[PDB]
Amino acid sequence: GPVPFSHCLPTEKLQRCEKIGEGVFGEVFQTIADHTPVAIKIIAIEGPDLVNGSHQKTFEEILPEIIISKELSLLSGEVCNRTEGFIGLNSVHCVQGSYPPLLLKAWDHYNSTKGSANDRPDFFKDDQLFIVLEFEFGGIDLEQMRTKLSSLATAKSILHQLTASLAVAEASLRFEHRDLHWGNVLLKKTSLKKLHYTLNGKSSTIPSCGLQVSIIDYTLSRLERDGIVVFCDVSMDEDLFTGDGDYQFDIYRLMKKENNNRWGEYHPYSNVLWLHYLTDKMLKQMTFKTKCNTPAMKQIKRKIQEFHRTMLNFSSATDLLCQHSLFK
Ligand SMILES: c1cc(-c2c[nH]c3cc4cnccc4cc23)ccn1
Numbered sequence: 525g526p527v528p529f530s531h532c533l534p535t536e537k538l539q540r541c542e543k544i545g546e547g548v549f550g551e552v553f554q555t556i557a558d559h560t561p562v563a564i565k566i567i568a569i570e571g572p573d574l575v576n577g578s579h580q581k582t583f584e585e586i587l588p589e590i591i592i593s594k595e596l597s598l599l600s601g602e603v604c605n606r607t608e609g610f611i612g613l614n615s616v617h618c619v620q621g622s623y624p625p626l627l628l629k630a631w632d633h634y635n636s637t638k639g640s641a642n643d644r645p646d647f648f649k650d651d652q653l654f655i656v657l658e659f660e661f662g663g664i665d666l667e668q669m670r671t672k673l674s675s676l677a678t679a680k681s682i683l684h685q686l687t688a689s690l691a692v693a694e695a696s697l698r699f700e701h702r703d704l705h706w707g708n709v710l711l712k713k714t715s716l717k718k719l720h721y722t723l724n725g726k727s728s729t730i731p732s733c734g735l736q737v738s739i740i741d742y743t744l745s746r747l748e749r750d751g752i753v754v755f756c757d758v759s760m761d762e763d764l765f766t767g768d769g770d771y772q773f774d775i776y777r778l779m780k781k782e783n784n785n786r787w788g789e790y791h792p793y794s795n796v797l798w799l800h801y802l803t804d805k806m807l808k809q810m811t812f813k814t815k816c817n818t819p820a821m822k823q824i825k826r827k828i829q830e831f832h833r834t835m836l837n838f839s840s841a842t843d844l845l846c847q848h849s850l851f852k
């Protein structure tokens with residue numbers, strides 16, 4: 525059976541909710557559970573009302589996200605193919621109720637301060653179902669940190685972390701993110717100097733520059749285990765491929781070209797495309813505490829420029845991580 529909203533979000537948890545993000549198919553709140561920060565994603569399912577410009581997902585249409593979230597969450601505890609560069613999934617519930625006024629309050633504050641593209645979620649009836657995913661808290665997204673990084677050395681760490689994470693998921697799960705815009709890259713402060721990953725049994729380190737990167741939001745993602753493929757089939761979707769105003773929206777069309785609109789197949793080139801979009805963002809749309817005025821910064825910039833103009837000649841995140849000069 526579904527449980528009441530109160531079972532997942534009792535009052536003290538609701539009272540500490542702060543909205544941190546959104547999309548067509550999800551509101552995301554930060555809160556505290558057992559004195560520990562968490563991020564809660566809430567998705568309306570199975571209901572008749574339009575929400576945020578779409579029909580609601582069915583339970584079946586949400587399973588891919590749940591499954592892929594569970595799989596990627598495993599990767600921090602594996603051995604041969606191991607990374608912390610995804611996000612932990614703690615729990616999944618099916619909840620029933622109208623939307624809690626306290627969530628509406630936090631939604632309102634977000635709308636007042638950052639602005640929303642979503643409908644105010646205030647029209648759901650007390651029979652409405654939602655999926656509630658509780659994740660580990662992964663930090664602040666790269667878009668909101670676009671004026672906050674220390675230098676291009678930090679950016680280099682971020683690219684390396686992302687490439688490694690995607691490589692490990694490629695090797696373990698034939699994973700493609702398929703929607704890795706800069707909202708889906710989280711940064712968190714760490715006092716670790718060196719982050720560790722293991723790819724096909726070989727362990728390596730990455731200088732952190734004080735950040736841990738987490739890749740989030742598996743709504744468009746694809747993977748497989750033992751020949752069973754889990755993905756979001758967008759072969760008939762029209763909107764996803766007619767965006768403009770940002771390279772982000774070319775990526776969707778370039779992915780479609782690479783895979784011939786067959787979304788069940790494995791095309792890890794999609795990870796390269798996203799990494800290219802991210803590198804592009806770092807070179808064009810970011811401001812740094814240290815400017816381009818030292819030999820070191822000139823060199824790292826030159827290297828990231830060389831990465832930008834050569835990376836699309838590689839076939840996967842694995843290929844980039846193993847072969848590209850940037851990571852040597
Ligand atoms: C839209 C926005 C988001 C989103 C923005 N900022 C976030 C921070 C999180 C931290 N940890 C874990 C998950 C988190 C999720 C988000 C996710 C999905 N769709």
Ligand SMILES: [Zn+2]
Pocket residue numbers: 617
């Ligand atoms: Zn429970």
